Amino acid sequence: AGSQWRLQQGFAANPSGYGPLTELPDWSYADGRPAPPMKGQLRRKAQREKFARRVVLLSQEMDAGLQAWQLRQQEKLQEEEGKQKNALKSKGALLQN
Amino acid sequence: GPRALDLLRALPRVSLANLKPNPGSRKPERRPRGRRRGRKCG
Amino acid sequence: GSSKNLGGKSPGKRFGIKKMEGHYVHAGNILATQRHFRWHPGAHVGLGKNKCLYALEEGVVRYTKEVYVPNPSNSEAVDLVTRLPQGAVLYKTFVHVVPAKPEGTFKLVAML
Amino acid sequence: PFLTAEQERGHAAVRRAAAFQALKAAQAARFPAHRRLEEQLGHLLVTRKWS
Amino acid sequence: VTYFSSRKGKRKTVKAVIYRFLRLHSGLWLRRKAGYKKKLWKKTAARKRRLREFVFCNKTQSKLLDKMTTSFWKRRNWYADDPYQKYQDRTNLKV
Amino acid sequence: KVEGDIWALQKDVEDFLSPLLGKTPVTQVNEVTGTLRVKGYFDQQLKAWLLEKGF
Amino acid sequence: KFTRSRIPDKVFQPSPEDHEKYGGDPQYPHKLHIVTRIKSTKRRPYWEKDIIKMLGLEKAHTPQVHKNIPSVNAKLKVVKHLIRIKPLKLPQGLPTEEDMANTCLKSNGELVVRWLLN
RNA sequence: UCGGAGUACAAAAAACCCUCCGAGUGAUUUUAAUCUAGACAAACCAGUCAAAAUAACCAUAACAUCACUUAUUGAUCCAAAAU
RNA sequence: GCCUAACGAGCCUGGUGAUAGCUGGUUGUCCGAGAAAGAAUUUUAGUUCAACCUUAAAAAUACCCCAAAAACCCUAAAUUCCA
RNA sequence: GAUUACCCCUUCUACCUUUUGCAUAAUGGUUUAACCAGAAAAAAUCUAACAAAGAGAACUUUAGCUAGAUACCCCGAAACCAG
Ligand SMILES: [K+]
Ligand SMILES: [K+]
Ligand SMILES: [K+]
Ligand SMILES: [K+]
Ligand SMILES: [K+]
Ligand SMILES: [Mg+2]
Ligand SMILES: [Mg+2]
Ligand SMILES: [Mg+2]
Ligand SMILES: [Mg+2]
Ligand SMILES: [Mg+2]
Ligand SMILES: [Mg+2]
Ligand SMILES: [Mg+2]
Ligand SMILES: [Mg+2]
Ligand SMILES: [Mg+2]
Ligand SMILES: [Mg+2]
Ligand SMILES: [Mg+2]
Ligand SMILES: [Mg+2]
Ligand SMILES: [Mg+2]
Ligand SMILES: [Mg+2]
Ligand SMILES: [Mg+2]
Ligand SMILES: [Mg+2]
Ligand SMILES: [Mg+2]
Ligand SMILES: [Mg+2]
Ligand SMILES: [Mg+2]
Ligand SMILES: [Mg+2]
Ligand SMILES: [Mg+2]
Ligand SMILES: [Mg+2]
Ligand SMILES: [Mg+2]
Numbered sequence: 001a002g003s004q005w006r007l008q009q010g011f012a013a014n015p016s017g018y019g020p021l022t023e024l025p026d027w028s029y030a031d032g033r034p035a036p037p038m039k040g041q042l043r044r045k046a047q048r049e050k051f052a053r054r055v056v057l058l059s060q061e062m063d064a065g066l067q068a069w070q071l072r073q074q075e076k077l078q079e080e081e082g083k084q085k086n087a088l089k090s091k092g093a094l095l096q097n
Numbered sequence: 098g099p100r101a102l103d104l105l106r107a108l109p110r111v112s113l114a115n116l117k118p119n120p121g122s123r124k125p126e127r128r129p130r131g132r133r134r135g136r137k138c139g
Numbered sequence: 140g141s142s143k144n145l146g147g148k149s150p151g152k153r154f155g156i157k158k159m160e161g162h163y164v165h166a167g168n169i170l171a172t173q174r175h176f177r178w179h180p181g182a183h184v185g186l187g188k189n190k191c192l193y194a195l196e197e198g199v200v201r202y203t204k205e206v207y208v209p210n211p212s213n214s215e216a217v218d219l220v221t222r223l224p225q226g227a228v229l230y231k232t233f234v235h236v237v238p239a240k241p242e243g244t245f246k247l248v249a250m251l
Numbered sequence: 252p253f254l255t256a257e258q259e260r261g262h263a264a265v266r267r268a269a270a271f272q273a274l275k276a277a278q279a280a281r282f283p284a285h286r287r288l289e290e291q292l293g294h295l296l297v298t299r300k301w302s
Numbered sequence: 303v304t305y306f307s308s309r310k311g312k313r314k315t316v317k318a319v320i321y322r323f324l325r326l327h328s329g330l331w332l333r334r335k336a337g338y339k340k341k342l343w344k345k346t347a348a349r350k351r352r353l354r355e356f357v358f359c360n361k362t363q364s365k366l367l368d369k370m371t372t373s374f375w376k377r378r379n380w381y382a383d384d385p386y387q388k389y390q391d392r393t394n395l396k397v
Numbered sequence: 398k399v400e401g402d403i404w405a406l407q408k409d410v411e412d413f414l415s416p417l418l419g420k421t422p423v424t425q426v427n428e429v430t431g432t433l434r435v436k437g438y439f440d441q442q443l444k445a446w447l448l449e450k451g452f
Numbered sequence: 453k454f455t456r457s458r459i460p461d462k463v464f465q466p467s468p469e470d471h472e473k474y475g476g477d478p479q480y481p482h483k484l485h486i487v488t489r490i491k492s493t494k495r496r497p498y499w500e501k502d503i504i505k506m507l508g509l510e511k512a513h514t515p516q517v518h519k520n521i522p523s524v525n526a527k528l529k530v531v532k533h534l535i536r537i538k539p540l541k542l543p544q545g546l547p548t549e550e551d552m553a554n555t556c557l558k559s560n561g562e563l564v565v566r567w568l569l570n
Numbered sequence: 571u572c573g574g575a576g577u578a579c580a581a582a583a584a585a586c587c588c589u590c591c592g593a594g595u596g597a598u599u600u601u602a603a604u605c606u607a608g609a610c611a612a613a614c615c616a617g618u619c620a621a622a623a624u625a626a627c628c629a630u631a632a633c634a635u636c637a638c639u640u641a642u643u644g645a646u647c648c649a650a651a652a653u
Numbered sequence: 654g655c656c657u658a659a660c661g662a663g664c665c666u667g668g669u670g671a672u673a674g675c676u677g678g679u680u681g682u683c684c685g686a687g688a689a690a691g692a693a694u695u696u697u698a699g700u701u702c703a704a705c706c707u708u709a710a711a712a713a714u715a716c717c718c719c720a721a722a723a724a725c726c727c728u729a730a731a732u733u734c735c736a
Numbered sequence: 737g738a739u740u741a742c743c744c745c746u747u748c749u750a751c752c753u754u755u756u757g758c759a760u761a762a763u764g765g766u767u768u769a770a771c772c773a774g775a776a777a778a779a780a781u782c783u784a785a786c787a788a789a790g791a792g793a794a795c796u797u798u799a800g801c802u803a804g805a806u807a808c809c810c811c812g813a814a815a816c817c818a819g
Contacts, residue, residue, distance in 0.1 A: 159581090
């Protein structure tokens with residue numbers, strides 16, 4: 001067993017998890033040409049690629065959403081100064097003052 | 098027009114031995130025999 | 140012994156609040172039904188003979204706490220107001236319906 | 252949290268809208284499949300013989 | 303309901319349904335409110351008006367009455383000066 | 398009552414109704430019978446379209 | 453009667469010693485979650501079952517990545533006793549389009565872009 | 571069988587041969603119309619509200635009231651009365 | 654009491670395949686989805702509706718759901734509603 | 737399950753019916769052969785003919801009409817009436 005030790009060292013808890021004992025091809029032709037890939041290995045490399053795309057998609061949406069909020073904050077302030085620089089010069093009591 | 102008639106020359110002759118009803122026209126009947134339709138018969 | 144209590148069985152009348160704040164209601168929808176005066180009617184809200192509140196105009200239902208000024212012809216209510224100390228005012232809850240659709244619009248029907 | 256409640260207001264809504272639209276499109280394509288002559292004329296191959 | 307009669311072998315109808323229901327060609331059935339002739343002095347003005355109004359029947363009641371009557375009463379009829387003649391067909395029904 | 402290349406008829410229908418709906422309509426082709434089935438009520442539009450083509 | 457449990461906001465106030473104990477960053481919160489389900493939805497109320505279903509945690513011991521926005525955190529707090537949550541670390545940064553197929557997620561919670569080169 | 575309070579503490583619903591009150595109608599005149607949007611309630615049958623419009627009368631007049639006001643009630647068929 | 658080995662009323666045949674909400678039985682393989690009870694009822698050993706569910710079909714929104722919001726003497730866990 | 741080896745070892749509370757729940761000390765069966773129990777097309781869905789019309793008369797018709805396919809058991813009372 002000893003899964004706690006393996007997790008401490010960075011390896012998988014189960015020795016069948018993404019270790020060098022699993023990823024590498026178990027058999028090859030004698031002459032030296034590579035063997036056809038395993039069905040399991042190809043499937044395992046499809047969910048990892050799918051997982052990586054999800055991380056990139058999630059990271060970009062959060063960053064893009066943050067940018068939109070900053071734009072609105074600047075837009076709100078720029079609109080406020082527009083009203084100040086668009087009204088008329090208050091004459092009122094300042095004419096006699 | 099009927100280009101399917103060209104295909105009939107290659108195919109064997111149509112007789113009573115090879116005739117099939119239109120698929121879906123005859124839903125099969127279910128009889129109360131077996132584990133599924135059994136011991137209560139619905 | 141024997142049971143003395145009789146007639147205790149009666150189904151509920153489903154008295155309660157129907158439309159919460161923010162619901163879009165049309166004219167005639169019953170906003171709420173009640174036994175006693177729990178919510179008083181407000182703007183654009185009628186009042187039936189059985190004290191049910193129904194919206195009069197199409198719009199958004201809103202709930203509000205406002206002051207209470209009773210009708211002078213209501214002897215019991217005006218007496219309660221009379222005995223209050225000078226620093227107090229009655230507060231009650233009200234149901235409003237802010238209109239959404241305008242009354243109407245002007246359109247060109249004929250250009251002579 | 253990384254973002255506050257206000258900064259996440261509708262940050263990812265086009266994807267949510269597109270996901271629902273894809274669901275409607277796939278569910279609206281439900282229709283009987285095409286019927287071709289090869290399926291009907293392929294039954295005559297039952298009695299194929301060696302002459 | 304007599305599914306198979308003993309004389310002709312056809313499907314009979316229940317005369318109770320026809321004497322108190324009207325079937326429109328759209329499938330909807332028509333009926334009177336219960337108690338529209340009993341103790342009128344006791345009921346209020348609004349209640350009497352409600353009891354004097356024709357009403358429709360829901361799906362289960364409509365489906366029930368279609369299995370109790372034969373196919374003669376579901377036909378299309380063109381009566382002269384029929385008040386319900388314009389209600390026979392449904393219109394603008396987006397289901 | 399369609400004779401000939403039915404798939405030509407289906408393609409001509411698809412791009413005829415595409416601008417009206419914004420999407421390709423769902424169709425069924427029945428070569429054993431010669432019948433094209435289109436999902437929706439387009440009978441009036443199709444009758445005018447076939448009349449212009451002279452069928 | 454048994455009903456939902458309301459978690460007071462005083463629970464989620466971290467002590468100054470919490471950051472050093474769990475290896476968190478005192479100033480900048482992490483960006484992405486890694487959620488792994490541990491226990492079972494059985495013998496638990498129905499509202500906890502739906503939250504597990506709608507978070508993609510149907511299969512146990514399978515990591516799933518979620519954002520750190522309050523909307524996701526609101527649902528995680530309900531089922532925080534059925535899942536394991538670890539931060540997502542990026543020693544080499546976000547993967548590019550060239551290295552999508554070589555990514556591997558280690559147990560300690562870091563995503564290695566280039567795995568078993570050559 | 572029907573209503574009110576608690577059990578049923580805060581939207582609705584919720585039981586017992588569970589704990590306590592009632593109803594099977596009176597008093598009075600303001601004798602309370604016709605027609606229709608939209609809703610509450612509900613297995614069904616039933617029950618409830620209701621703007622606009624028309625008539626009645628201040629000549630641009632609709633909630634019968636009071637008694638905890640909530641309950642004061644009965645489906646077809648059939649019978650009798652003017653219809 | 655007895656009337657051909659069973660008499661609170663004989664035996665045989667016919668009506669008779671009497672009728673049972675009650676008990677027992679219900680015959681090949683494999684696969685998909687899958688329900689514990691709200692309302693009336695000489696009704697609670699049963700039926701007919703509603704809910705739930707199955708098969709097919711159409712359509713757009715469903716769950717989670719922040720702030721605001723829901724009673725007057727005191728009142729917990731918490732519900733309703735909603736981006 | 738195995739095993740060089742039949743046992744020895746290890747692991748498993750008969751089967752249907754009926755129930756909230758049956759190894760139950762709840763029901764039935766000694767075993768074998770033969771015999772013994774789902775049946776109907778009004779509305780509907782699937783396939784096809786022809787289509788504002790369909791059907792080999794009599795009818796149905798605001799996309800309908802005609803034809804086919806898909807359906808709903810067996811054994812048992814005490815009794816009642818006539819000859
Ligand atoms: K069965
Ligand atoms: K019974
Ligand atoms: K026994
Ligand atoms: K028994
Ligand atoms: K048995
Ligand atoms: Mg069947
Ligand atoms: Mg059969
Ligand atoms: Mg059996
Ligand atoms: Mg009760
Ligand atoms: Mg009570
Ligand atoms: Mg309702
Ligand atoms: Mg008025
Ligand atoms: Mg009767
Ligand atoms: Mg004898
Ligand atoms: Mg029998
Ligand atoms: Mg029961
Ligand atoms: Mg049902
Ligand atoms: Mg809230
Ligand atoms: Mg919503
Ligand atoms: Mg046991
Ligand atoms: Mg028992
Ligand atoms: Mg059972
Ligand atoms: Mg036994
Ligand atoms: Mg027994
Ligand atoms: Mg025995
Ligand atoms: Mg039929
Ligand atoms: Mg008799
Ligand atoms: Mg006799």
